[PDB]
Design a protein around this ligand. Structure first.
Ligand code: 780
Ligand code: CA
Length: 223
């Protein structure tokens, strides 16, 4: 997260870190045994880390659970990143409390102008790599489809939306991929891509979760 602030330990209880010997992506806890992340974050050997704040120190509240299976959307296209969503089933259920909690899926899509909270342990520099130890947060608004499409002509599908600042300076970045975009207490997006980080006129692009709610529900119901 570039231009964000320190969230404060366990203030974002549905945030998870996908770890394979190091933190590589974020994710959101939606129930005690399932997490949603981005399909481009897929790999084998994923350990899900819940209740984290400082990813390099065990401080208490953490729960490390291995993933039993990862389900990448069947229509995920790695070249366009259309349908960039994945579900991870945990080997065992997490113990939910006030530090580890699930986030609700939306009943409707959000509108431009809606203010959302994006969080993660991704890069904090737009020019260079500086990864933090603690969770960073950023408040950003969903942009209108015309500003999104004018920024990335030909690259936005109806399963994506832009959120951020056209002036640059604040944005999600590499390492934040897979994490949550929560607006009005509902999970509306998944950090997916962008051109660089916090560059002028190149806002972040997110997977539009409202379009996948029936899919998520059906898939969880059958696995
Ligand atoms: N400007 C942005 N809002 C933004 C957001 C997420 C990003 N994620 C990335 C990204 C860049 C390089 C590699 C990965 C990557 C690839 C495979 C696995 C994990 C991360 C990224 O997610 N750039 C990103 C840029
Ligand atoms: Ca820790």
């Amino acid at each position: 997260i570039v231009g964000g602030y320190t969230c404060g330990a366990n203030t974002v209880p549905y945030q998870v870190s996908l770890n394979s010997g190091y933190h590589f992506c974020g994710g959101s806890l939606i129930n005690s045994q399932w997490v949603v992340s981005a399909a481009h974050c897929y790999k084998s050997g994923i350990q899900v880390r819940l209740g984290e704040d400082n990813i390099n120190v065990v401080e208490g509240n953490e729960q490390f659970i291995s993933a039993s299976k990862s389900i990448v959307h069947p229509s995920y296209n790695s070249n366009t990143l259309n349908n960039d969503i994945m579900l991870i089933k945990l080997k065992s259920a997490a113990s939910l409390n006030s530090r580890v909690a699930s986030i609700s899926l939306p009943t409707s899509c959000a509108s431009a102008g809606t203010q959302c909270l994006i969080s993660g342990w991704g890069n904090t520099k737009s020019s260079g790599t500086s990864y933090p130890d603690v969770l960073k947060c950023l408040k950003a608004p969903i942009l209108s489809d015309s500003s999104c499409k004018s920024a990335y002509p030909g690259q936005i599908t109806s399963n994506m939306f832009c959120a951020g600042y056209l002036e640059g300076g604040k944005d999600s970045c590499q390492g934040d991929s897979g994490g949550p975009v929560v607006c009005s207490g509902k999970l509306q997006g998944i950090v997916s891509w962008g051109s660089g980080c916090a560059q002028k006129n190149k806002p972040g692009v997110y997977t539009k979760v409202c379009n996948y709610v029936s899919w998520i529900k059906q898939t969880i119901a059958s696995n």
